[PDB]
């Protein structure tokens, strides 16, 4: 076909949970919609603030048989405020048939404080790395592994916690390219 589509959030889904890297817990207590940005404010989550760093767990429509995504472009905009401005992975994906379930990460430059910054992440092996490998290692994910993750995505996470002592964090414009025929 060559029918370029984008998965995005349902207009109705106006809230996006926070999670630790572990996905051991989830928080909503401090998250609110303020069109278009979706906002997590720390002061409404003080009870939970040790479980940091936090990631946004994208909703199920990004998960699953997503082989067609391999074209490219995971897109989203990020904004945040913290006391000062300075390792942790920008985005995190897990997926696979049990025999090949594995976790990979994408590292990027920390976004600036106060400046809404945009990310577009190419959905291909060449730039991702392996969870558990220090970011300074020059190994990247094999095409083969990558594709086996896409074959069934378990979850995609995007960094919510930034700088030092963070006040609030906003994410918007969330989309990922797929394909139809």
UniProtKB/Swiss-Prot annotation:
Domain of life: Eukaryota
Location(s), subcellular: Secreted, Extracellular space, Extracellular matrix, Basement membrane
Domain Laminin IV type A: 1-181
Tissue specificity remark: Placenta, striated muscle, peripheral nerve, cardiac muscle, pancreas, lung, spleen, kidney, adrenal gland, skin, testis, meninges, choroid plexus, and some other regions of the brain; not in liver, thymus and bone.
Domain text: The alpha-helical domains I and II are thought to interact with other laminin chains to form a coiled coil structure.
Disease tied to this entry: Merosin-deficient congenital muscular dystrophy 1A: Characterized by difficulty walking, hypotonia, proximal weakness, hyporeflexia, and white matter hypodensity on MRI. Muscular dystrophy, limb-girdle, autosomal recessive 23: A form of autosomal recessive limb-girdle muscular dystrophy, a myopathy characterized by proximal and/or distal muscle weakness and atrophy. The age at onset is variable and can range from the first to the sixth decade, although later onset is less common. LGMDR23 is characterized by slowly progressive proximal muscle weakness primarily affecting the lower limbs, increased serum creatine kinase, dystrophic features, gait difficulties, and white matter abnormalities on brain imaging.
Subunit composition and interactions: Laminin is a complex glycoprotein, consisting of three different polypeptide chains (alpha, beta, gamma), which are bound to each other by disulfide bonds into a cross-shaped molecule comprising one long and three short arms with globules at each end. Alpha-2 is a subunit of laminin-2 (laminin-211 or merosin), laminin-4 (laminin-221 or S-merosin) and laminin-12 (laminin-213). Interacts with FBLN1, FBLN2 and NID2.
Function: Binding to cells via a high affinity receptor, laminin is thought to mediate the attachment, migration and organization of cells into tissues during embryonic development by interacting with other extracellular matrix components.
Listed name of the protein: Laminin subunit alpha-2
Gene: LAMA2
Residue span relative to the full protein: 1180 to 1364 of 3122
């Amino acid at each position: 076909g060559l029918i370029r589509t984008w998965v995005t959030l349902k207009a109705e889904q106006t809230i996006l949970p926070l999670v630790d890297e572990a996905l051991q817990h989830t928080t909503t207590k401090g998250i609110v919609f303020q069109h278009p940005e979706i906002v997590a404010h720390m002061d409404l989550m003080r009870e939970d603030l040790h479980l940091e760093p936090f990631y946004w767990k994208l909703p199920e429509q990004f998960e699953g048989k997503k082989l067609m995504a391999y074209g490219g472009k995971l897109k989203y905009a990020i904004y945040f405020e913290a006391r000062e401005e300075t390792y942790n992975p920008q985005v995190i994906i897990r997926g696979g048939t049990p025999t090949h379930a594995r976790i990979i990460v994408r590292h990027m430059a920390a976004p600036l404080i106060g400046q809404l910054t945009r990310h577009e992440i190419e959905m291909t092996e060449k730039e991702w790395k392996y969870y558990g490998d220090d970011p300074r290692v020059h190994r990247t994910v094999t095409r083969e592994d990558f594709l086996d993750i896409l074959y069934d995505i378990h979850y995609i996470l995007i960094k919510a916690t930034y700088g030092n002592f963070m006040r609030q964090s906003r994410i918007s414009e969330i989309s990922m390219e797929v394909a139809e025929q």
